[PDB]
Design a protein around this ligand. Structure first.
Ligand SMILES: *[C@@H]1O[C@H](CO)[C@@H](O)[C@H](O)[C@H]1NC(C)=O
Ligand SMILES: *[C@@H]1O[C@H](CO)[C@@H](O)[C@H](O)[C@H]1NC(C)=O
Ligand SMILES: *[C@@H]1O[C@H](CO)[C@@H](O)[C@H](O)[C@H]1NC(C)=O
Ligand SMILES: *[C@@H]1O[C@H](CO)[C@@H](O)[C@H](O)[C@H]1NC(C)=O
Ligand SMILES: *[C@@H]1O[C@H](CO)[C@@H](O)[C@H](O)[C@H]1NC(C)=O
Ligand SMILES: *[C@@H]1O[C@H](CO)[C@@H](O)[C@H](O)[C@H]1NC(C)=O
Ligand SMILES: *[C@@H]1O[C@H](CO)[C@@H](O)[C@H](O)[C@H]1NC(C)=O
Ligand SMILES: *[C@@H]1O[C@H](CO)[C@@H](O)[C@H](O)[C@H]1NC(C)=O
Ligand SMILES: *[C@@H]1O[C@H](CO)[C@@H](O)[C@H](O)[C@H]1NC(C)=O
Ligand SMILES: OC[C@@H](O)[C@@H](O)CO
Ligand SMILES: OC[C@@H](O)[C@@H](O)CO
Ligand SMILES: OC[C@@H](O)[C@@H](O)CO
Ligand SMILES: OC[C@@H](O)[C@@H](O)CO
Ligand SMILES: OC[C@@H](O)[C@@H](O)CO
Ligand SMILES: OC[C@@H](O)[C@@H](O)CO
Ligand code: NA
Ligand code: NA
Ligand code: NA
Lengths: 606, 606, 606
């Protein structure tokens, strides 16, 4: 006579299957396997970069400031009518006999200006040899020497225009700088020089560039310089180039072009540079600098490189030094040092290696080193793409390694679990089966197979319980589970059955049991429970009350949340530009406006 | 009489529950679901950047080196008193009638210097028209032409000051360069020119900038140039600007400002630029370059951009060329090309797309393209923040995708597992229950629920076994499990029970069994085993001996270890700066020290 | 008489074990635990960088363009013989009495040139005081003023050489710029000045650098400037430096060196800068800029820094302003502001913090702030290594956090699973055991242990079934499972047994069963099934037919695929260089070729 308290569930009549429909538990699947593991070859690496450093060398300038001053005299004053200042070369001979020999210098200048030979006499007086005194010391200045420090104008002869000459033999060490092709260089003064620093006579150095005549250059063999301050003769000789331009006479110690120059610079040395082979490329991993390189499989011809001899010396010099401190007692060099080109344009020198362990493998890999086998290379300033490559790769693996491993433990588990479901199905088919089919049913074991038949739904408001459970027709023998009556649909007849497990509606009431004392049980009725006390209904219940426990194992996985990368520079191109103390462009844009701003440019009088 | 060998464990008396405390297995939880999946719209993209390239064009300089030389003669020598060198413009008329027509040039100069008109005659001789010969070929030099190559000084008249003039009409092609606003430009020589290259008369070009008078500029219409070397007349005419500065006469072919100029440069072309919508922004993914862009939802007005017409031509020119080689047979353009602004300042042109597949969706998305709808933009040099954005995002997903998927397989598993625990509990409640409650207990099935009662601990040193298992009161009927006696506490009475499963202390000995031959068994006693042989104790044991097998499935997960990112530049700002051959600042800092170092600056004589 | 249809499997005879070999289920392992969780200390941070900005200040130039022109007159024309132009300083006195007082200027120049005092008179006429008019307005130009705008040449006296003087007192405001050590600076004009801007007399400013005499510098105390355009006297006084170089007289308002200068620049302000302690270093995480810093544990002495006072003011000024808008009501400053040095060279100022929550912890951490306790620092331009560090770390954790958590849920699961396998083994040992041992066997429970004995293989082509299952010797009592006969090897005798579960060959046929109606079953025979209908063979079968269901739970894990990072720059070093309008190097390389190209350099006549 008693209904249900909560109807947020559904009942099901489970008529035994006939065998019509038959299923089977899916057999174990085949589990994936971890890759054979990447093979990393050890090897010392050296990375060269496009040398943007100008070739630098030292030199010395020899010239004479020639200044002629004209003056007009007044009754109680005077004025410069014109100061015509000029700068003349110190003839080759004077540079050797006077300056280099005795630290002296002629009081005259003698050179060619405007297709003509002029001659200046200091103070318009007879010629003399004057000693060279050091120039005034100044903050951050190369060494400088000169003849006199006082100019010379005409002696007073009132109401007249007189002329006065001033000669100052100046010599100072400067810094010259040349760039590829090295067919011309510049001094610290700004004076350009249109000859190769490597020009000369010895050893084919005469095919170097010169835009000058032949009587201007004079290479001196076996040359000992006499310092102009300490006055000491050089202990060793040099081959000395001496060029004489219309404005000055440069000189410098001649050296060969190939050894003194190189279009590449040793940039990064790497102890451990892992080399691997991925789909027709080599990945040079450097854990140290966090950088991975991508190259081709075949080497790169050094001979194809324009002026790149330092590379050889530079590289080997390092691979030896490293092999020493490190590989001297653990590894061995494999094949000769190899050279490959990387994306962006970084030249990489490599020396494959093997530990004393795998000594037995030398033979094979040695061949693999040999199977690897006039312009200039352009390199990028940004090495981020590689560190991205490195960082991404480094992570691409771990994630896939761990997640890959996980995948396998899983497959093995599901297959491993089958064992249990198999046993469980025999025990409680109606329960195990349902889950598996996805729908609520009833099933039986036709040997080694299952045969299922669906269970018909029944609303809860169509279910009644009997206030008792005792049998009178068999006293001392009651039912193990509560008695109930139910309805199909709403207007259909009323049926009676015995309450089963998990709201099954059993058509039979053969689940009998010899009555006993201390009989107390809870039976899942509706969306909750029904507590019968001593073979008699007591009251229903919600599932909330009954203390809940868990067969589930928890796992708290949050997701990785978004993040914005703000554009960030340490120094903007604006700062970088501003940093410069002087700006040529600005200086000219300003200075060249002078006559527009401060003067009249078109006005003419007659 | 026999104790235990190992006492690193604990015993438990498990008195049947009364039903007082009752629990229930937690019901299946609800499993999360993978997001609906991100919607990526295909589209061809073009990315423009702040054009830092100066506007560049070609021109030609017309001037005359005017040099007056004064000389003093001696008995056996001579000297330059003053060489006053000047540089004069070639008047507009002469540039057309003499130079352009016949490759000739006047032997005179005629111009205004210092608010006055001066006239120089070459060699101080009557005027002439002289032909223009090519200048001496030099390494890397623009074309140059001139009149004469020999200077001119006065003929000898001993003991006198004489005057000599030298005129050299020089013409040479130079490279001019202008920057925004393009109201002035510079020549390859360093000479500034304070007029817009776009100045002129035609089509409002007269509102361009000029800091000069009107008689200095002269635009020539229908202009055919006669090459000075090949002597050939141009086949096509140009509008020719001719400005005459106090120092020289520039000239160049006039062109419009808007088409010839643009404040942006087509930088990167992208075939596949995925566009997505995340919380009020568009993420432009380029797999190719590894770069993701962040923009607003509404477009950006090109009209708002200052001088940006090339952008239009540039963009479309590309989206067509790409759509051709690629999208010609697979996709279709959606709406008009759209323009959005990205962080950092990269202008992005986009052309949304759809494959022939989803042709039925054109209508809707077309509107979504239209719903999208005078200064200059500043762009950063660093595109790393984006490649970080890209790289991070690319990984942020996979990890969350896979780990997300995992989470779900888990929830489903635990719920799936419940089925088993349910069956297992009926079988062996005391075992299944314990694990679940967390503590060791005993339990019974009060229908569809569990009722538990704790088990009291018993030290191992308080446990004794009987050397036998045979019953005399029922011969041919022994016990299935060993006999034992135990103690509560240490000083308490001694109790007798039957050994149960996993060290349970059963209060009853009703586990009887008809004796049999070949009876041999191991029973978990203490921290090990007790091997009874033929219903009689034989000896205890440690668990070590018994071959162990595993129900567990292994998973080896290591963690991702730290890594340091060393600061790494390919070229330091120091190198970058050094690379430059000449440094204006250095040159001036040095040169301007001259008089301090090598001369006397305050000394005065009278 | 009937064989098998499919033989892609194997049969096994499973003779009961004797107890010889005995095993045991591995006991639960100990599960790892998540780390105690990283402790992050909140704190406001400010990051300074190597200041590459030149020190900038304003000044004013005072000079006089002195121009002497000489002309020769002809019958119908004239010419400049020589224009000797010079530039003279405006004496200290004139700068105060004439220019600053009345906006006037002397019509004469009076200075020292070439160790001699010259005197120029404008127009060669008596001295005058001339007013200073503004210079012609020009695009983007500092203020300029001058005396006259018309030059002056000699009046016509035909057939003669006459002389004319021109003096133009010019004054213009320029921008000076100095760099460390700030012992010299330059003007906007390009004129260098070899004195420290901080030189003076007051407060030890006389130990600053000067390469000049003492009569050239003149610091004026209590100085009010009278604007030359508005003519207004300054409302406040300044200490005014006035240096007089041979070419011009600079002047500027003197200021102290330490406050006006600093070798570092406040670069990035960070509200939330997480500070953590990892193996002897601090990691400064800024979520905002995506950047993590690495420093030492002990602070860095500011006193050790050369000229770094602005840092103090700059830093605190910010930490206060932030603490205001934010920490004013939630946190509290902990200890004094601390300073540490980071890799690459970024100075970081930090102010540790605690929320009002953990107020009780102030005491301890305060000490930890104190336990933390003349050159210049070099900073890198690339901040990518840090954003890599940040990005990598940020991900290194999540992956390890989640995957770590996973590992634990696993261990707990396997141990949790043991419970089930334990129950399952009792039920079906032959099944549960096999899986566990890895090989197919049969086993029995010797109490609390297992005893196994292998099962011998039997080819399928050696297996026959009986067309029926009914017993005649016991009518109304048949077998539950099909009858079969089999062979060991190929030539061995024929044995008879009863079909068991999963192709076991039972030696006994005691699995009898009282015959029943509606008997229909499938028995796994060979690689498929055998369907007996009513105790009689009907036909074999393949496993394909029988509807398959799954006990396995799916998990779809793909791997993270490779990706190439193309080298990518926004502006190449080539563009960066090109961008510059003028290039000094180019200008000189070109200009200095002049005489080679356009003239004769060696030819001499006599
Ligand atoms: C790497 O080397 C191992 C043995 O050293 C070898 O078994 C394996 O084949 C190699 N890796 C690959 C991908 O072939
Ligand atoms: C490697 O060789 C291929 C084929 O010549 C070429 O396309 C590719 O650019 C090369 N890679 C590098 C790093 O230059
Ligand atoms: C995670 O789930 C919740 C917190 O979100 C909590 O109830 C549970 O105990 C947590 N599990 C573990 C072990 O982290
Ligand atoms: C993406 O498109 C699909 C169908 O094309 C749609 O079902 C889904 O709603 C869209 N994504 C989101 C997040 O709405
Ligand atoms: C997008 O619009 C918002 C609102 O005007 C603005 O704050 C933000 O700066 C814009 N984003 C970009 C990329 O400029
Ligand atoms: C991982 O665990 C250990 C090695 O740490 C080893 O005993 C076991 O076999 C490994 N499992 C697998 C399958 O990697
Ligand atoms: C971090 O702080 C917590 C309490 O605030 C403490 O228990 C823990 O020991 C600290 N972390 C470490 C690694 O010691
Ligand atoms: C920190 O101190 C150690 C020991 O003096 C030193 O080697 C290291 O370079 C320092 N770190 C930094 C950031 O300079
Ligand atoms: C994943 O496995 C396959 C697709 O590869 C499919 O049959 C299955 O349904 C998928 N499982 C889930 C839930 O993603
Ligand atoms: O470029 C010439 C080369 O020698 C230098 O850069 C390095 O030594
Ligand atoms: O033309 C030179 C002018 O611009 C100033 O530099 C003079 O000091
Ligand atoms: O800046 C002017 C523009 O035309 C060039 O940069 C590219 O063509
Ligand atoms: O003032 C010019 C001096 O610095 C040298 O460049 C001369 O060669
Ligand atoms: O370098 C001097 C300093 O004061 C400036 O860079 C910032 O104010
Ligand atoms: O020597 C100056 C020449 O190179 C040109 O700049 C003249 O206009
Ligand atoms: Na003489
Ligand atoms: Na004449
Ligand atoms: Na006079």
């Amino acid at each position: 006579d008693i209904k249900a308290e909560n109807t947020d569930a559904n009942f099901y009549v489970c008529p035994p299957p006939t065998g019509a429909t038959v299923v089977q538990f899916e057999q174990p699947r085949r589990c994936p396997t971890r890759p054979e593991g990447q093979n990393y070859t050890e090897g010392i690496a050296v990375v060269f970069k496009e040398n943007i450093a100008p070739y630098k060398f030292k030199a010395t300038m020899y010239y004479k400031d020639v200044t002629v001053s004209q003056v007009w005299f007044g009754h109680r004053s005077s004025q410069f009518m014109g100061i015509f200042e000029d700068r003349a070369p110190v003839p080759f001979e004077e540079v050797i006999d006077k300056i280099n020999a005795k630290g002296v210098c002629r009081s005259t200048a003698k050179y060619v200006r405007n297709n003509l030979e002029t001659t200046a006499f200091h103070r318009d007086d007879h010629e003399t040899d004057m000693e060279l005194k050091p120039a005034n010391a100044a903050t951050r200045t190369s060494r400088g020497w000169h003849t006199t420090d006082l100019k010379y104008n005409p002696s007073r002869v009132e109401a007249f225009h007189r002329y006065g000459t001033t000669v100052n033999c100046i010599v100072e060490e400067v810094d010259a700088r040349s760039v590829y092709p090295y067919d011309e260089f510049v001094l610290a003064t700004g004076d350009f020089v249109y000859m190769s620093p490597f020009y000369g006579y010895r050893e084919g150095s005469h095919t170097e560039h010169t835009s000058y005549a032949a009587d201007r250059f004079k290479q001196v063999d076996g040359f000992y310089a006499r310092d102009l301050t300490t006055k000491a003769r050089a202990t060793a000789p040099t081959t000395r180039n001496l060029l004489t331009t219309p404005k000055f006479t440069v000189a410098w110690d001649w050296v060969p072009k190939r050894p003194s120059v190189c279009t590449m610079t040793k940039w990064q040395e790497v102890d451990e540079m892992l080399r691997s082979e991925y789909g027709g490329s080599f990945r040079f991993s450097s854990d140290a600098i966090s950088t991975t390189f991508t190259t081709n499989l075949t080497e790169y011809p050094l001979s194809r490189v324009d002026l790149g001899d330092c590379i050889g010396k530079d590289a080997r010099d390092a691979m030896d030094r490293i092999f020493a401190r490190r590989y001297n007692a653990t590894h061995i060099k494999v094949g000769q040092p190899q050279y490959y080109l990387a994306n962006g344009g970084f030249l990489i020198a490599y020396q494959p290696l093997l530990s004393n362990t795998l000594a037995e493998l030398y033979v094979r890999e040695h061949l693999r080193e040999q199977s690897r086998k006039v312009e200039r290379i352009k390199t990028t300033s940004s090495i981020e793409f590689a560190r991205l490559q490195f960082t991404y790769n480094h992570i691409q693996r771990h994630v896939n390694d761990m997640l890959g491993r996980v995948a396998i433990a899983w497959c093995e588990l599901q297959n491993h679990e089958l064992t249990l479901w198999n046993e469980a199905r025999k025990l409680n088919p109606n329960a195990i089966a349902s889950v598996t089919v996805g729908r609520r049913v009833s099933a039986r074991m036709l040997g080694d197979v299952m045969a299922v038949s669906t269970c018909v739904p029944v609303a809860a408001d169509n279910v009644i319980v009997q206030n008792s459970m005792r049998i009178s027709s068999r006293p001392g023998a009651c039912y193990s589970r509560p008695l109930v009556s139910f309805r199909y649909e709403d207007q259909g007849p009323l049926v009676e059955g015995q309450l089963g497990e998990n709201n099954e509606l059993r058509l039979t009431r053969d689940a009998i049991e010899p009555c006993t004392v201390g009989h107390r049980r809870y039976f899942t009725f509706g969306g909750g429970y029904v507590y019968f006390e001593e073979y008699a209904y007591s009251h229903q219940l919600s599932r909330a009350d009954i203390t809940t426990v868990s067969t589930f194992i928890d796992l708290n996985i949050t997701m990785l949340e978004d993040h914005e990368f703000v554009p960030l520079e340490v120094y903007t191109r604006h700062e970088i530009k501003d940093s410069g103390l002087l700006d040529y462009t600005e200086v000219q844009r300003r200075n060249q406006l002078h006559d527009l701003r401060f003067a009249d440019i078109d006005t003419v009088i007659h």
